Amino acid sequence: ATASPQLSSEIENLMSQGYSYQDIQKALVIAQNNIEMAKNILREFVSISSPAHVAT
């Protein structure tokens, strides 16, 4: 319950990096909708095809 904007913003954090929402939601199920545990799982697991991430 309670769609918290900040926790959802956590998704947006790695989302902005190019990460895929399919695996993002996947990260949430293992991370029990955690902040860092989800963004960390994407880092650990799924990869990004988007070119130039740290180009800013």
From Swiss-Prot:
It comes from the Eukaryota. Coiled coil: none annotated. The modification Phosphoserine is found at S50. Phosphorylated on tyrosine residues by ALK, EGFR, SYK, FYN and ZAP70. Phosphorylated on tyrosine residues in response to FLT1 and KIT signaling. Phosphorylated on tyrosine residues by INSR and FGR. Phosphorylated on several tyrosine residues by constitutively activated FGFR3. Phosphorylated on tyrosine residues by activated CSF1R, PDGFRA and PDGFRB. Phosphorylated on tyrosine residues by HCK. Ubiquitinated, leading to its degradation via the proteasome. Ubiquitination is negatively regulated by IFT20. It is found in: Cytoplasm; Cell membrane; Cell projection, Cilium; Golgi apparatus. Residues 6-45 form the UBA domain. E3 ubiquitin-protein ligase that acts as a negative regulator of many signaling pathways by mediating ubiquitination of cell surface receptors. Accepts ubiquitin from specific E2 ubiquitin-conjugating enzymes, and then transfers it to substrates promoting their degradation by the proteasome. Recognizes activated receptor tyrosine kinases, including KIT, FLT1, FGFR1, FGFR2, PDGFRA, PDGFRB, CSF1R, EPHA8 and KDR and mediates their ubiquitination to terminate signaling. Recognizes membrane-bound HCK, SRC and other kinases of the SRC family and mediates their ubiquitination and degradation. This protein has one functional calcium-binding site. The RING-type zinc finger domain mediates binding to an E2 ubiquitin-conjugating enzyme. The N-terminus is composed of the phosphotyrosine binding (PTB) domain, a short linker region and the RING-type zinc finger. The PTB domain, which is also called TKB (tyrosine kinase binding) domain, is composed of three different subdomains: a four-helix bundle (4H), a calcium-binding EF hand and a divergent SH2 domain. It is linked to Noonan syndrome-like disorder with or without juvenile myelomonocytic leukemia: A syndrome characterized by a phenotype reminiscent of Noonan syndrome. Clinical features are highly variable, including facial dysmorphism, short neck, developmental delay, hyperextensible joints and thorax abnormalities with widely spaced nipples. The facial features consist of triangular face with hypertelorism, large low-set ears, ptosis, and flat nasal bridge. Some patients manifest cardiac defects. Some have an increased risk for certain malignancies, particularly juvenile myelomonocytic leukemia. Forms homodimers; IFT20 promotes the formation of stable homodimers. Associates with NCK via its SH3 domain. The phosphorylated C-terminus interacts with CD2AP via its second SH3 domain. Binds to UBE2L3. Interacts with adapters SLA, SLA2 and with the phosphorylated C-terminus of SH2B2. Interacts with EGFR, SYK and ZAP70 via the highly conserved Cbl-N region. Also interacts with SORBS1 and INPPL1/SHIP2. Interacts with phosphorylated LAT2. Interacts with CBLB. Interacts with ALK, AXL, BLK, FGR and FGFR2. This is E3 ubiquitin-protein ligase CBL. It comes from Homo sapiens (Human). The chain holds residues 851 to 906 of 906 of the full protein.
